[PDB]
């Protein structure tokens, strides 16, 4: 992961940004969907 | 019972660890003691294996 502040909404920003390890779970379990989560 | 009951017939408790090694995580290592630091020196180093 990684953050940074932009200006742009509609299209990614132009530029490189590198995506730090944060989180290396051993979870050992498969994985084939997902779904993810809003707040309202 | 009796809080002196003899072998054989006085409580036992047992515990059970077991060792697990499969596809799950292998956190398994070895009884390093941390050792201290030395420097200037030929020296044979090993750092976190």
Same mark, same amino acid.
């Given at each position: 992961?990684?953050?940074?502040?932009?200006?742009?909404?509609?299209?990614?920003?132009?530029?490189?940004?590198?995506?730090?390890?944060?989180?290396?779970?051993?979870?050992?379990?498969?994985?084939?969907?997902?779904?993810?989560?809003?707040?309202? | 019972?009796? *809080?002196?009951?003899?072998? =054989?017939?006085?409580?036992?408790?047992?515990? $059970?660890?077991?060792?697990?090694?499969?596809?799950? *995580?292998?956190?398994?290592? =070895?009884?390093?003691?941390?050792?201290?630091? $030395?420097?200037?020196?030929?020296?044979?180093?090993?750092?976190?294996?």
């Amino acid at each position: 992961s990684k953050h940074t502040p932009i200006n742009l909404v509609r299209d990614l920003p132009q530029g490189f940004s590198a995506l730090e390890p944060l989180v290396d779970l051993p979870i050992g379990i498969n994985i084939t969907r997902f779904q993810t989560l809003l707040a309202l | 019972f009796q *809080p002196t009951n003899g072998v =054989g017939y006085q409580p036992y408790r047992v515990v $059970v660890l077991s060792f697990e090694l499969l596809h799950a *995580p292998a956190t398994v290592c =070895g009884p390093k003691k941390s050792t201290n630091l $030395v420097k200037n020196k030929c020296v044979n180093f090993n750092f976190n294996g």
